[PDB]
Amino acid sequence: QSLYREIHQLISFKDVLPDKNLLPDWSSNKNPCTFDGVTCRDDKVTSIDLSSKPLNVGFSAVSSSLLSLTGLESLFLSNSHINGSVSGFKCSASLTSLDLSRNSLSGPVTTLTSLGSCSGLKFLNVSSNTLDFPGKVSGGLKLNSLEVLDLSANSISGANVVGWVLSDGCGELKHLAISGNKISGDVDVSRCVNLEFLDVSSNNFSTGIPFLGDCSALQHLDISGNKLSGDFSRAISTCTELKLLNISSNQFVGPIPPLPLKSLQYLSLAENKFTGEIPDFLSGACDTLTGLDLSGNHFYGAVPPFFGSCSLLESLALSSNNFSGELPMDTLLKMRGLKVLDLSFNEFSGELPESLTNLSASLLTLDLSSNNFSGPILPNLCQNPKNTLQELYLQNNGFTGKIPPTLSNCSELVSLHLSFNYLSGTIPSSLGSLSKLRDLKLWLNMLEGEIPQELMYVKTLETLILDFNDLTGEIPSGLSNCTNLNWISLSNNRLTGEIPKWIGRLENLAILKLSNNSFSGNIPAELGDCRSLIWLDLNTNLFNGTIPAAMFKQSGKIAANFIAGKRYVYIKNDGMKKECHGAGNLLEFQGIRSEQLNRLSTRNPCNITSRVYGGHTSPTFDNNGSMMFLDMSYNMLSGYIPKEIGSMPYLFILNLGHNDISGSIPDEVGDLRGLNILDLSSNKLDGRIPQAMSALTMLTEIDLSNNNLSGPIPEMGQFETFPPAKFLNNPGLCGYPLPRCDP
Ligand SMILES: *[C@@H]1O[C@H](CO)[C@@H](O[C@@H]2O[C@H](CO)[C@@H](O[C@@H]3O[C@H](CO[C@H]4O[C@H](CO[C@H]5O[C@H](CO)[C@@H](O)[C@H](O)[C@@H]5O)[C@@H](O)[C@H](O[C@H]5O[C@H](CO)[C@@H](O)[C@H](O)[C@@H]5O)[C@@H]4O)[C@@H](O)[C@H](O[C@H]4O[C@H](CO)[C@@H](O)[C@H](O)[C@@H]4O)[C@@H]3O)[C@H](O)[C@H]2NC(C)=O)[C@H](O)[C@H]1NC(C)=O
Ligand SMILES: *[C@@H]1O[C@H](CO)[C@@H](O[C@@H]2O[C@H](CO)[C@@H](O[C@@H]3O[C@H](CO)[C@@H](O)[C@H](O[C@H]4O[C@H](CO[C@H]5O[C@H](CO)[C@@H](O)[C@H](O)[C@@H]5O)[C@@H](O)[C@H](O)[C@@H]4O)[C@@H]3O)[C@H](O)[C@H]2NC(C)=O)[C@H](O)[C@H]1NC(C)=O
Ligand SMILES: *[C@@H]1O[C@H](CO)[C@@H](O[C@@H]2O[C@H](CO)[C@@H](O[C@@H]3O[C@H](CO)[C@@H](O)[C@H](O[C@H]4O[C@H](CO)[C@@H](O)[C@H](O)[C@@H]4O)[C@@H]3O)[C@H](O)[C@H]2NC(C)=O)[C@H](O)[C@H]1NC(C)=O
Ligand SMILES: *[C@@H]1O[C@H](CO[C@@H]2O[C@@H](C)[C@@H](O)[C@@H](O)[C@@H]2O)[C@@H](O[C@@H]2O[C@H](CO)[C@@H](O)[C@H](O)[C@H]2NC(C)=O)[C@H](O)[C@H]1NC(C)=O
Ligand SMILES: CC[C@@H](C(C)C)[C@@H](O)[C@H](O)[C@@H](C)[C@H]1CC[C@H]2[C@@H]3COC(=O)[C@@H]4C[C@H](O)[C@H](O)C[C@]4(C)[C@H]3CC[C@]12C
Ligand SMILES: *[C@@H]1O[C@H](CO)[C@@H](O[C@@H]2O[C@H](CO)[C@@H](O)[C@H](O)[C@H]2NC(C)=O)[C@H](O)[C@H]1NC(C)=O
Ligand SMILES: *[C@@H]1O[C@H](CO)[C@@H](O[C@@H]2O[C@H](CO)[C@@H](O)[C@H](O)[C@H]2NC(C)=O)[C@H](O)[C@H]1NC(C)=O
Ligand SMILES: *[C@@H]1O[C@H](CO)[C@@H](O[C@@H]2O[C@H](CO)[C@@H](O)[C@H](O)[C@H]2NC(C)=O)[C@H](O)[C@H]1NC(C)=O
Ligand SMILES: *[C@@H]1O[C@H](CO)[C@@H](O)[C@H](O)[C@H]1NC(C)=O
Ligand SMILES: *[C@@H]1O[C@H](CO)[C@@H](O)[C@H](O)[C@H]1NC(C)=O
Ligand SMILES: *[C@@H]1O[C@H](CO)[C@@H](O)[C@H](O)[C@H]1NC(C)=O
Ligand code: NA
């Protein structure tokens, strides 16, 4: 109250910070109403917001200094590096909202009961902390005066945790979120008659569907990301106010049951096992439906035409089912509000009706990937002015013809995916006018010609995927201006020339795959200036000279974060004929079926069956890392391997096989702790196998055959694991698994 007490409480909080300089304008002889982070009314402090400031202090400092302020109405400390746990404290009765999200609060969730000191508390957000529920679930939260409680993203593992929260009553509760825990058991919110928002998603619920009682107030129901399979239809039948219903990522089955459609705006049944065709009774929702997600089920049939009246539908996700027929334009154009259209991974056939060019001017995302669409790409597409299309996903179809340069009109285009098709012609230089294009993916086509240098104008280019084409020429110098590139893969073309030394300017460059081309010259030492390079595949080319030791200078300082989250497939080498080269083909694979990897048989000499790994890219570190994959096999590299080769603790494959490398294996190779595969076969390596290699503990595969090696095999680590074949054609070589070292 009194200004003297206000200032001293606040400054005592500042004086406890490890870095007092985080609150620079907080001074012991100014009015706190002038402080950054402070809100005042009539010269009295009412709210404090130090969110996203690394205060690095325990909750004891908060409760004793800030939460004791008389008249403080709200305290926001989201992502402030608060740790410790909530304990008893004297709480101003004016405090109504407390945001302690995204901190390091620990202890059992029963600690939050001590927040009952706050007689006026109505909003509590302790999400993204480490509260848990050890031992028995008993007692109660005893915060029944709350209107909004968010316990999401904690470490709460237990059954009937929800009952524990609401045990003491929930008449006042309007918004409950406990998502992202490991909670199970029953959800009984029938006594919470003013509950409008319920999010129990991403938990461990596998038994009863939540019981909603009269469901008088519920507008938002999210039970997705569990293992539910019960009769949710009966559970929500009385939910006349339900605006959002998310039951996706569960174990539900059967046809689409009855649903409350009066107020329904968002409906997701995605990632379940629902069957049948889209029922007609869903037309009742078209007065209000703004988003529909039926993706990832066993639906079939055409798109019912009642969807024509769904004029408010902004997103229509039907992907990964078995819908067939031609592109139902008769219905799509009536969807005046449609902004996202996802029919991917279906069996929609036919050519692209001309009327499709109209949707370009309203859609933001047109996803038709993985279907039976034939014919060419509409040249008249995007010819409608002020087009708004941002994502065009047509990959894995049967499109023929050329890439229409008119796609340059789609000025708002950020991602372009024409891969896995039969497109001929060249890459039009007009694509360089896409000032916002980030993803350009055109791999597995029949594109001839050179790469357009007009891409130097695309300063936002992030990925550049052009594998399996007939491209000739060199790497255009203009791409140096594409400094945001994090993925460039040009393999299986007929490219020539060298790797430009400006490759080291691309600090975001993480993956660089150039295999099965005719690149020449030495390895640029500037590849060591790449702060993000983690995947380097140069196999089957004409590189010569020696390996520069400088390319491994960024080891221990590599960052790999922008590259994470990208769908890929890794096709392990068949290990059969000498035709298949390299460890494996890392291939971009967004919106493509692995079943259609048979198309690679006409372009890749490898056996694909039982050798295709997939998923989303996930580097083994966030910072202070190194290179992960290094394959320069099938070239003409000479000289000796530099000792710096062993400075990559995250390298799990190293293939230098089929070259002209001389000298001995550096003992530093034994520092490659993470090495899974080590191929050095078909070279001129001489000397003994360094004993330090017996320290490699994760080698699932080695091959030192066809060299000039001699002496005993380390035979102290994993070398006995391997069959003789991996050591044959080394005359002087001996020791198990080879014949014993004799005179
Ligand atoms: C109906 O219910 C369903 C199911 O419950 C629900 O679907 C979930 O929706 C949420 C929110 O949309 C999803 O969670 C988010 O997923 C994001 C994607 O994570 C991937 O990509 C990350 C990189 O993102 C960047 O790059 C990618 C690729 O270049 C690009 O697409 C992105 O736009 C972006 O630029 C990547 O880091 C991540 O990998 C890490 O995380 C995953 C776990 O998610 C882990 O498995 C990996 O090992 C790795 O650690 C992954 O590949 C992601 O952006 C996002 O995270 C941000 O937001 C959260 C808060 O939402 C913050 O906590 C976080 O700090 C980030 O800011 C978040 O995780 C979720 O995956 C969906 N679940 C399913 C099953 O689909 C619907 O939304 C509901 N619908 C409604 C309510 O209408
Ligand atoms: C660098 O790129 C060029 C292309 O630019 C690659 O050369 C291509 O290689 C293709 C695959 O070898 C080849 O197509 C094949 O052609 C023959 C007839 O000529 C067909 O029989 C093949 O399809 C049929 O047979 C294969 C047989 O099995 C495959 O896998 C096993 C694995 O050991 C091998 O024995 C065999 O070599 C096959 O690869 C079946 O898988 C098929 O389903 C089908 O029944 C192929 O279509 C192209 O003609 C050829 N291109 C050129 C320009 O000559 C080149 O190999 C590549 N090099 C690399 C990556 O190192
Ligand atoms: C309790 O605190 C947590 C932690 O702050 C809080 O969760 C956070 O909520 C915000 C807001 O919803 C999330 O950020 C959103 O993320 C999604 C996906 O990227 C977007 O839809 C949102 O965009 C909105 O904001 C943009 C910027 O203004 C707008 O351009 C856009 O139109 C949208 O309005 C938004 O960025 C954030 O990710 C979470 N954080 C975590 C860690 O989950 C939670 O809401 C709080 N609980 C309560 C009950 O208030
Ligand atoms: C790496 O190769 C380049 C390109 O030339 C190839 O390799 C040569 C050794 C020879 O076999 C050529 O027919 C190949 O096309 C080399 O540049 C060549 O340098 C050599 C040696 O002085 C010379 O005879 C050629 O004329 C050069 N070619 C050109 C186009 O200027 C380069 O020197 C090779 N690097 C090493 C370390 O040998
Ligand atoms: C590719 C995308 C990555 C990004 C980060 C670039 C990342 O997302 C991946 O997870 C990557 C690091 C995976 C996919 C394929 C896996 C292969 C499988 O094939 C084998 O069998 C190999 C031989 C042997 O079995 C060995 O033990 C396992 C081997 C080497 C693994 C290694 C790890 C993977 C490479
Ligand atoms: C998710 O729920 C399942 C099922 O309730 C849990 O598995 C049970 O674990 C207990 C404790 O060990 C066992 O007594 C049961 O036999 C298990 N049941 C089954 C069907 O396996 C599982 O542990 C939960 N997971 C988490 C992360 O909480
Ligand atoms: C998915 O749909 C396809 C396409 O309809 C089904 O395969 C057959 O398709 C032909 C038309 O080309 C129909 O005459 C047949 O009746 C379809 N078969 C059956 C059994 O319905 C395919 O079976 C469907 N299922 C899956 C899992 O893809
Ligand atoms: C690719 O590998 C698969 C196995 O992953 C091979 O499958 C063989 O199939 C033939 C008949 O076509 C059988 O005689 C073999 O016994 C199978 N081998 C297995 C299952 O290991 C397939 O032949 C390989 N393809 C090529 C071209 O070599
Ligand atoms: C909170 O973080 C500080 C700063 O690292 C640390 O010294 C302290 O031990 C932490 N407190 C608890 C209770 O873990
Ligand atoms: C459509 O392509 C799928 C594979 O993506 C195939 O199973 C199906 O038979 C094809 N349909 C027609 C009519 O060609
Ligand atoms: C390309 O980068 C060079 C300098 O490396 C610069 O002179 C040139 O103007 C850049 N191009 C564009 C279009 O900005
Ligand atoms: Na081109």
From Swiss-Prot:
Brassinolide binds at Y568, Y613, S618, N676. A motif (Cys pair 1) lies at residues 33-40. GO terms for cellular component: endosome; endosome membrane; plasma membrane; protein-containing complex. It catalyses: L-seryl-[protein] + ATP = O-phospho-L-seryl-[protein] + ADP + H(+); L-threonyl-[protein] + ATP = O-phospho-L-threonyl-[protein] + ADP + H(+); L-tyrosyl-[protein] + ATP = O-phospho-L-tyrosyl-[protein] + ADP + H(+). Changing C40Y: In bri1-5; brassinosteroid-insensitive semi-dwarf mutant. Phosphorylated on at least 12 sites, with a preference for Ser residues. A motif (Cys pair 2) lies at residues 734-741. Keywords: ATP-binding, Brassinosteroid signaling pathway, Cell membrane, Endosome, Glycoprotein, Kinase, Leucine-rich repeat, Lipid-binding, Membrane, Nucleotide-binding, Phosphoprotein, Receptor, Repeat, Serine/threonine-protein kinase, Signal, Steroid-binding, Transferase, Transmembrane, Transmembrane helix, Tyrosine-protein kinase. The record marks N676, Y736 as: Interacts with SERK1. It is found in: Cell membrane; Endosome membrane. It is a single-pass type I membrane protein. Monomer or homodimer in the plasma membrane. Heterodimer with BAK1 in the endosomes. Interacts with SERK1 and TTL in a kinase-dependent manner. Bind to SERK1 in a brassinolide-dependent manner. Component of the SERK1 signaling complex, composed of KAPP, CDC48A, GRF6 or GRF7, SERK1, SERK2, SERK3/BAK1 and BRI1. Interacts with CDG1. No interactions with PSKR1 or CNGC17. Interacts with BIK1. Interacts with B'ALPHA, B'BETA, B'GAMMA and B'ETA. Interacts with BSK1 and BSK3. Interacts with BSK5, BSK6 and BSK11. Belongs to the protein kinase superfamily. Ser/Thr protein kinase family. Binding of brassinosteroid induces intramolecular autophosphorylation of BRI1. Interaction with BAK1 activates both receptor kinases and the full activation of either receptor kinase requires transphosphorylation by their partners. Homodimerizes in the absence of ligand and binds brassinosteroid in the absence of its coreceptor BAK1. This is Protein BRASSINOSTEROID INSENSITIVE 1. It comes from Arabidopsis thaliana (Mouse-ear cress). The gene is BRI1. The chain holds residues 30 to 772 of 1196 of the full protein.
